[PDB]
Amino acid sequence: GSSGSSGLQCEICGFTCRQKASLNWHQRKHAETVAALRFPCEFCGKRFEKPDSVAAHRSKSHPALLLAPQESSGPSSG
Ligand SMILES: [Zn+2]
Ligand SMILES: [Zn+2]
């Protein structure tokens, strides 16, 4: 077959599709879905319909930030 790109990857949710159309058709919905999410991610900027999901996301996508950083301390707000 043809070697090169494997498949497209969405940034909104993180889906993957082979055909370009799919992505577009899969994004058109995001434009309306964005409304649902009310609690944004102060870590990356994402958004969720609720905080419960925003807190866990940081443990799956930002699981390397929550933990103590390198020797060099930093300003933590809590
Ligand atoms: Zn998506
Ligand atoms: Zn995030």
List the domains of the chain with CATH numbers: 1-78 (3.30.160.60)
Could you count the other beta carbons within 10 Å of the beta carbon of residue 46? Answer: 20
Q: From which experimental method does this structure derive?
A: NMR
CA dist 40 and 18 (Å) reads 29
Residues around ligand 1, an ion, CB closer than 5 A: 10, 12-13, 15
Name 15's Cβ contacts closer than 8 Å, sequence gap at least 6. 9, 23, 26
Phi/psi of residue 60, each to 5°? -120, -30
Task: Judge contact between 30 and 22, C-beta under 8 A.
Answer: no
Residues around ligand 2, an ion, CB closer than 5 A: 41, 43-44, 46
58, exposed or middle or buried, with CB in 10 Å at 0-12, 13-18, 19+? Answer: middle
Residue type, 36: A
* Nearest ligand by distance to the CA of 14: 1
**CA 3 – ligand 1 centroid, Å:** 25
